[PDB]
């Protein structure tokens, strides 16, 4: 994947921040079915161009969504106003090269992404709460017809006077699993719309039933 | 005089329960004391309140005190008699539980010259 979008030979173009709308099922011309995800880009715009000259690093501050003065907390109302930039639901920074540097106040959209090529998403995933092992890590469990008060628990660290009561950094039942996990080197974008600025992807994009995803690798 | 004193003896609710709430009004205004007390839920607040208000009334009925220039300077608890009893367990093993009681003391003084800091607050 090269010679597309808008840049020179080699750089990283900025990322674009969208919302997981759901999944559906398309078909191809060769009569085969692929699952589909629709990522909705809410008129994302540039709100701060970060600078090695002044600040120290090369970053485009893309805002997404829409918000209202009754919903922002004044310390950011001031930010948006000083930038003179329409209000957005969530901010997000990207580090991109010296080229691929945008003017304050240029909106982005899905035609930034050439179809047929790949992306990398980052979606703060769907935690499940204070789960335990055997689901958190796919541990096994002792039988259900012989052993008591263990039917679903775990084992015990290596342990004896040597490795003296020193459980190394092991694997225990633990709190939730909501985090940001990329799906590296995604599979090509089916289609993106001129209006409505959606985009369909072959499937399995992390993030909630809405409100969370980022995209890069292009 | 000064440091008007009001104690309450035989409070039949354990000391680590009473002082837990007393620490809330350990050192501040009597008005807001009487107010935080009736919006706390813990059921030691009612006796702590009885005691602070009784201190204020004694401080009034004894001369030389302005029950609005009052603020609790010091106040604490103290264990009292607790009539022990046997305690039962499995396997015939016995134990003892002690139904506890305690006392509370409050000691108030005028707000001598600290309104100047308070308004600054």
């Amino acid at each position: 994947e090269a010679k597309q979008g808008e840049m020179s030979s080699r750089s990283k173009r900025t990322g674009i921040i969208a919302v997981k709308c759901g999944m559906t099922a398309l078909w191809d011309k060769w009569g085969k079915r692929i699952p589909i995800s629709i990522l909705w880009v809410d008129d994302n715009i540039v709100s701060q161009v970060k600078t090695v000259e002044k600040e120290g690093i090369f970053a485009l501050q893309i805002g997404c969504g829409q918000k209202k003065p009754k919903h922002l907390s004044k310390a950011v109302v001031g930010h948006f106003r000083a930038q003179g930039v329409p209000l957005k639901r969530k901010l997000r920074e990207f580090p991109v090269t010296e080229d691929a540097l945008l003017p304050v106040g240029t909106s982005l959209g899905v035609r930034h992404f050439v179809p047929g090529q790949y992306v990398d998403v980052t979606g703060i995933t769907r935690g499940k709460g204070f789960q335990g092992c055997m689901k958190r890590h796919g541990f096994s469990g002792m039988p259900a017809s012989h052993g008591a008060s263990l039917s679903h628990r775990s084992g015990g660290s290596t342990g004896q006077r040597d490795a003296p009561g020193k459980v190394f950094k092991g694997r225990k039942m633990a709190g939730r699993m909501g985090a940001d996990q990329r799906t590296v080197k995604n599979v090509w974008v089916y289609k993106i719309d001129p209006a409505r600025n959606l985009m369909w992807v072959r499937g399995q994009v992390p993030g909630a039933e809405g409100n969370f995803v980022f995209i890069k690798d292009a | 005089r000064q440091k008007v004193q009001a104690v309450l003896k035989s409070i039949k609710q354990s000391p680590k329960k009473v002082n837990l709430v007393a620490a809330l009004v350990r050192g501040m205004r009597v008005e807001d004391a009487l107010m935080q007390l009736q919006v706390t839920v813990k059921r030691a607040s009612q006796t702590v309140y009885r005691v602070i208000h009784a201190a204020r009334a004694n401080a009034t009925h004894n001369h030389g005190l302005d029950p609005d220039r009052l603020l609790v300077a010091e106040a604490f608890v103290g264990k009292g008699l607790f009539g022990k009893k046997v305690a039962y367990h499995a396997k015939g093993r016995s134990g003892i539980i002690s139904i506890p009681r305690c006392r509370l003391t409050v000691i108030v003084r005028e707000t001598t010259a600290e309104e100047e800091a308070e308004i600054a607050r």
């Binding site: - | 709430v21 620490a23 809330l24 107010m35 935080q36 009736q38 919006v39 706390t40």
Partner: protein, 41 residues
């Protein structure tokens, strides 16, 4: 076995925080946290 040091350290951070904003029925007597049905008028 474990002494005042640890006992105080453990019971401390479970300290009582004075309650924030607290309103009274201007004339109807009672005091209350917000969002209550003290009174009517």
């Amino acid at each position: 076995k474990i002494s005042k040091h640890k006992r105080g350290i453990r019971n401390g951070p479970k300290a009582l925080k004075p309650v924030p904003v607290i309103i009274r029925c201007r004339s109807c007597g009672r005091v209350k946290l917000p969002h209550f049905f003290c009174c009517s008028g």
